[PDB]
Design an enzyme around this catalytic site. Structure first.
Site, PDB file in Angstrom:
ATOM      1  CG  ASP A   1      36.939  72.715  25.573  1.00  0.00           C
ATOM      2  OD1 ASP A   1      37.653  71.815  26.082  1.00  0.00           O
ATOM      3  OD2 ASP A   1      37.104  73.953  25.741  1.00  0.00           O
TER       4      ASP A   1
ATOM      5  CG  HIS B   1      42.496  72.737  26.126  1.00  0.00           C
ATOM      6  ND1 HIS B   1      41.942  73.885  25.596  1.00  0.00           N
ATOM      7  CD2 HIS B   1      41.460  71.987  26.563  1.00  0.00           C
ATOM      8  CE1 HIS B   1      40.627  73.827  25.705  1.00  0.00           C
ATOM      9  NE2 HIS B   1      40.309  72.686  26.290  1.00  0.00           N
TER      10      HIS B   1
ATOM     11  CG  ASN C   1      38.788  67.440  32.422  1.00  0.00           C
ATOM     12  OD1 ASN C   1      39.527  66.467  32.546  1.00  0.00           O
ATOM     13  ND2 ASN C   1      39.197  68.679  32.637  1.00  0.00           N
TER      14      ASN C   1
ATOM     15  CB  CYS D   1      45.936  63.225  25.919  1.00  0.00           C
ATOM     16  SG  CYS D   1      47.216  63.570  27.154  1.00  0.00           S
TER      17      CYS D   1
END
Lengths: 340, 76
Positions: free
Chosen positions: A272, A255, A9, A14
């Site tokens: 994720d 998220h 991340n 996005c």
């Protein structure tokens, strides 16, 4: 301990990490990317080399993989760029670039082989004997979901005709302006089908860009033969769900995660960013249908916005094994010297 | 030549253009016909946002092609 590594991340990109995993697990594409002749490429500027680098690391790293060199290479180093363009625009930018880089090589044509379908856009005049049929290529399908129960209803909507009348009459050559109907027909569906679900729309009564959180159902196995002009009994257009790209939020941020079953066997994982975990089929599929509007939790705004399906007859080619022998030694050596 | 534009409401409109028209000229023609201010218009063809200073010819946009008007914020 899935054996699939995540992506860092590293800001407000996005859908980017979700798209990168989806493309990485399009194994035939990944193999072709490794074959691109990037020896002359400047690293700062080369999207082809940057994709080789990300894929190599997704294939070999035991730690989360960074993307800063990739975003630099295509020039979207701010949130604004990712907020203004959607996931399929980034996909098309990446694919167009690698397709061009593959011209004249041993893997020329990989992108259209995987992703390009054929349609006819037709205009039929209602009161003169005049029809214009034009062949068009497509690389994804944008599906309207508002008021549609499921993928079938969205496809019906997609192929519904538009009326050309009033101030929008069709220019029918020697016939002048004519009332007409305009539609599309599918001639082929590609091996890898990207279906974008329109989860934001313009509300004409309020001039506002609104989130659609409604329930929209999509199946793990999707038959599409009835949308083709001509079917093939030996190769039905039966599609297997491969990836579900999910957004949590009522605005254009929040998220982003992707669910994949890399092998096409219905064994799903949740990706994720740096955390990749096994999940249930319901967590990948039904939990992403939408339709929890009475629910005061993030569930109300969590739903799928893009689906990837693979044609069943093409699964073994699309998801063919990728080995280290598929990565040219010179490329490995270049990328290893950079990690230093 | 006549092209088509799908608006944000899903309506298909016709537009009379020339290959030499820049995209911002196309947006001006859309304003003339539909009243949409050019500043609100974003146009997609072949999966990419069209640049205001390039021409229809540059994008190989031919008669009966369909352009799409899209939301300014469409990503994440």
């Amino acid at each position: 301990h899935t054996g699939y590594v995540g992506l860092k991340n590293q800001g407000a990109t996005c859908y980017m990490n979700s798209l990168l995993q989806t493309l990485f697990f399009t194994n035939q594409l990944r193999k072709a990317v490794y074959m691109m002749p990037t020896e002359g490429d400047d690293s700062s500027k080369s999207v082809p080399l940057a994709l080789q680098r990300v894929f190599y690391e997704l294939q070999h790293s035991d730690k989360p993989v960074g993307t800063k060199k990739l975003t630099k290479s295509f020039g979207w180093e701010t949130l604004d760029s990712f907020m203004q363009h959607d996931v399929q625009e980034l996909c098309r930018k990446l694919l167009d670039n690698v397709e061009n880089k593959m011209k004249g090589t041993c893997v020329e044509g990989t992108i259209p082989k995987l992703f390009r379908g054929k349609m006819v856009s037709y205009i039929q005049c209602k009161e003169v004997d005049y029809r214009s049929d034009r062949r068009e290529d497509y690389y994804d399908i944008q599906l309207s979901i508002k008021g549609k129960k499921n993928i079938f209803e969205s496809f019906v909507d997609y192929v519904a005709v538009e009326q050309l009348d009033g101030d929008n009459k069709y220019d029918a050559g020697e016939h002048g302006l004519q009332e007409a109907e305009k539609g599309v027909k599918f001639l082929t569906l590609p091996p890898v089908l990207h279906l974008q679900l329109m989860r934001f729309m313009y509300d004409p009564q309020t001039d506002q860009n609104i989130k659609i959180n409604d329930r929209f159902e999509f199946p793990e196995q999707l038959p599409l033969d009835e949308f083709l002009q001509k079917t093939d009994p030996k190769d039905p257009a039966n599609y297997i769900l491969h990836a579900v790209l999910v957004h949590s939020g009522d605005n254009h941020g929040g998220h982003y995660v992707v669910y994949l079953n890399p092998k096409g066997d219905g064994k799903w994982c949740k990706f994720d960013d740096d955390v990749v975990s096994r999940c249930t089929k319901e967590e990948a599929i039904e939990h992403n249908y939408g339709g929890h509007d009475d629910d005061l939790s993030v569930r109300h705004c969590t739903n799928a916005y893009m689906l990837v399906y693979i044609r069943e007859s093409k699964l073994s080619e699309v998801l063919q094994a990728v080995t280290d022998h598929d990565i040219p030694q010179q490329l490995v050596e270049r990328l290893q010297e950079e990690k230093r | 030549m006549q092209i088509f534009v799908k608006t944000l409401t899903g309506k298909t409109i016709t537009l009379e253009v020339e290959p030499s028209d820049t995209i911002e000229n196309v947006k001006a023609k859309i304003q003339d016909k539909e009243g949409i201010p050019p500043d609100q218009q974003r146009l997609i063809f072949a999966g990419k946002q069209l640049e205001d200073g390039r021409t229809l010819s540059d994008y190989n946009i031919q008669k009966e092609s369909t352009l799409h008007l899209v939301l300014r914020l469409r990503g994440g």
